[PDB]
Amino acid sequence: SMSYTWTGALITPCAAEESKLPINALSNSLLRHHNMVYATTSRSAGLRQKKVTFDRLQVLDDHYRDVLKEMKAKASTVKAKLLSVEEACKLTPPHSAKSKFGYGAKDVRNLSSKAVNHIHSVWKDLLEDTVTPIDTTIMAKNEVFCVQPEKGGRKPARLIVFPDLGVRVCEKMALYDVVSTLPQVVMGSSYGFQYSPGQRVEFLVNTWKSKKNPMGFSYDTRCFDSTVTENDIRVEESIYQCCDLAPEARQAIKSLTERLYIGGPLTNSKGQNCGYRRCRASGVLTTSCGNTLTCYLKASAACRAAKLQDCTMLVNGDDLVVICESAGTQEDAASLRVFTEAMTRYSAPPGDPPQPEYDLELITSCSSNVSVAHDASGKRVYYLTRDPTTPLARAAWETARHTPVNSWLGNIIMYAPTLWARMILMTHFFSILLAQEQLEKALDCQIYGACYSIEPLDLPQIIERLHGLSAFSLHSYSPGEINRVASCLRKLGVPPLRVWRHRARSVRARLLSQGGRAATCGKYLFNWAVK
Numbered sequence: 337s338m339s340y341t342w343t344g345a346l347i348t349p350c351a352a353e354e355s356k357l358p359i360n361a362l363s364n365s366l367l368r369h370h371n372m373v374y375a376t377t378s379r380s381a382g383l384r385q386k387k388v389t390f391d392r393l394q395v396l397d398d399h400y401r402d403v404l405k406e407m408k409a410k411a412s413t414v415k416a417k418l419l420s421v422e423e424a425c426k427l428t429p430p431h432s433a434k435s436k437f438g439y440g441a442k443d444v445r446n447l448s449s450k451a452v453n454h455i456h457s458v459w460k461d462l463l464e465d466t467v468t469p470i471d472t473t474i475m476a477k478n479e480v481f482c483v484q485p486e487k488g489g490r491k492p493a494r495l496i497v498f499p500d501l502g503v504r505v506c507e508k509m510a511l512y513d514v515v516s517t518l519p520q521v522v523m524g525s526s527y528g529f530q531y532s533p534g535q536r537v538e539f540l541v542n543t544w545k546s547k548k549n550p551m552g553f554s555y556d557t558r559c560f561d562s563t564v565t566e567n568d569i570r571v572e573e574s575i576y577q578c579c580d581l582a583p584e585a586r587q588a589i590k591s592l593t594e595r596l597y598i599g600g601p602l603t604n605s606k607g608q609n610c611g612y613r614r615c616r617a618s619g620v621l622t623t624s625c626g627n628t629l630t631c632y633l634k635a636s637a638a639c640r641a642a643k644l645q646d647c648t649m650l651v652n653g654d655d656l657v658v659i660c661e662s663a664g665t666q667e668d669a670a671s672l673r674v675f676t677e678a679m680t681r682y683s684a685p686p687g688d689p690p691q692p693e694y695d696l697e698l699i700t701s702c703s704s705n706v707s708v709a710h711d712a713s714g715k716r717v718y719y720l721t722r723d724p725t726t727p728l729a730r731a732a733w734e735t736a737r738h739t740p741v742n743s744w745l746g747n748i749i750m751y752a753p754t755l756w757a758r759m760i761l762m763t764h765f766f767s768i769l770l771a772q773e774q775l776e777k778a779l780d781c782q783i784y785g786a787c788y789s790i791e792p793l794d795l796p797q798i799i800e801r802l803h804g805l806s807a808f809s810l811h812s813y814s815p816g817e818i819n820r821v822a823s824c825l826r827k828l829g830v831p832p833l834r835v836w837r838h839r840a841r842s843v844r845a846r847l848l849s850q851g852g853r854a855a856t857c858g859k860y861l862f863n864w865a866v867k
């Protein structure tokens with residue numbers, strides 16, 4: 337069960353890769369320790385390969401089997417349909433990698449005969465050949481981070497593995513309707529992707545408050561995708577086949593798991609053979625649903641193994657939160673050790689071992705945590721934050737560069753209630769949109785796995801719908817939260833919060849004087865700045 341087998345061949349780039357922040361005049365006003373902000377490249381690909389390559393041992397027991405039976409019973413109440421070639425094309429992402437067979441994502445979306453003809457041929461092949469492993473390409477991702485001191489520092493580039501565009505569209509034809517419906521039915525309230533930030537918070541908080549003495553922990557699996565075995569991917573297929581599906585859907589799902597999901601060969605961007613995969617591919621339709629199902633399965637079983645009492649789970653990828661009743665500090669510590677023992681048997685050991693927590697604010701998963709502030713009436717309001725280091729580092733990058741993804745705008749939307757998105761991100765970018773003549777100009781923005789064309793002036797209305805009117809009135813943030821933000825600004829050389837407020841006082845006035853919907857932005861987004 338070796339997760340990967342490699343050959344000499346290198347994981348290679350497809351174009352120029354920048355690894356370092358530039359020196360913009362605008363960038364330095366946000367952030368002045370510019371040697372801390374980097375970007376992964378193929379140069380580090382080999383370090384990542386080393387980490388993600390190991391033999392997997394997996395030993396199942398009745399806890400696993402009992403949970404899996406309960407899951408299949410739930411799956412058996414799901415019905416799902418085939419998408420037609422046309423529906424799958426229309427649901428294809430705008431900016432996904434072009435096909436080797438002469439068409440790209442925009443051709444797919446506009447139902448180009450070239451795309452449609454090819455996808456029909458790929459479908460027929462999936463139905464008629466259930467064995468030939470399907471080609472994939474492997475690439476090192478280009479993501480922006482901030483360096484860490486106390487940790488090792490510089491992370492290697494993540495690896496992505498994906499089949500051709502044509503195959504990706506067939507995946508949607510066979511499984512889009514499954515992957516969109518099945519998870520919620522099987523996992524119910526534990527299925528994290530159903531929640532907006534406020535609803536996730538509402539779930540964790542009501543869950544937390546229902547225990548007499550609450551204890552929670554997060555868990556995150558070391559190299560999760562590599563820990564996923566052929567057993568795991570076959571179990572997944574067996575859950576999908578519990579569904580009520582069309583005959584042709586069944587055939588394509590079985591075929592896709594034999595030819596693609598289970599494993600297959602890996603090829604370079606130059607066309608060379610890099611090796612063989614026997615674990616989860618990170619770039620298939622089924623990655624998110626599969627990781628979530630498999631993490632839930634193993635974690636549910638592992639909670640029974642550790643005898644955790646009145647457990648409640650929340651799962652996104654391999655990102656897991658558990659909230660249960662405390663048995664006491666030494667009891668909880670021992671239980672956690674037994675929880676990760678079971679998980680490790682099931683093949684999924686943790687990056688860092690979990691730690692029991694008695695303060696909900698201190699539980700981090702999906703890079704996020706719950707925290708408290710007060711609304712205009714002084715009432716306690718709970719909301720989702722995260723450490724602002726990465727959002728700021730990518731904000732500094734996107735100030736100095738094009739970027740067809742606007743992570744700053746995604747962060748303002750998702751984290752609109754936070755101290756840091758309000759004082760720093762909203763101020764910095766409205767200042768730049770004010771100086772350039774560009775308040776009316778729509779921007780591309782990737783959030784919750786989709787690409788939106790966002791008018792900056794729509795932000796008041798977006799934030800209100802997503803978070804509610806309170807997002808414009810929060811005050812009296814937690815000492816821990818305030819602390820973390822201030823210490824992150826010092827670490828990165830971004831100006832302290834008192835500077836951001838002055839700049840925002842001026843940003844607010846300039847928006848107000850500009851009159852219409854610009855002034856609406858000034859009122860709502862920056863009401864915090866003016867007494």
Ligand SMILES: O=C1c2cccc3c(NCCO)ccc(c23)C(=O)N1c1cccc(Br)c1
Nearest residue numbers: 755758759810811812818822833834837864
């Ligand atoms: O406006 C400030 C502010 C201005 C200047 C300095 C500080 C501040 N001092 C930084 C010490 O590290 C801490 C918190 C806030 C703050 C702080 O929480 N706020 C604030 C109050 C209400 C809403 C919002 Br958004 C921010």
Ligand SMILES: [Mn+2]
Nearest residue numbers: 556557558560
């Ligand atoms: Mn992980």
Ligand SMILES: [Mn+2]
Nearest residue numbers: 556653654655
């Ligand atoms: Mn994770």
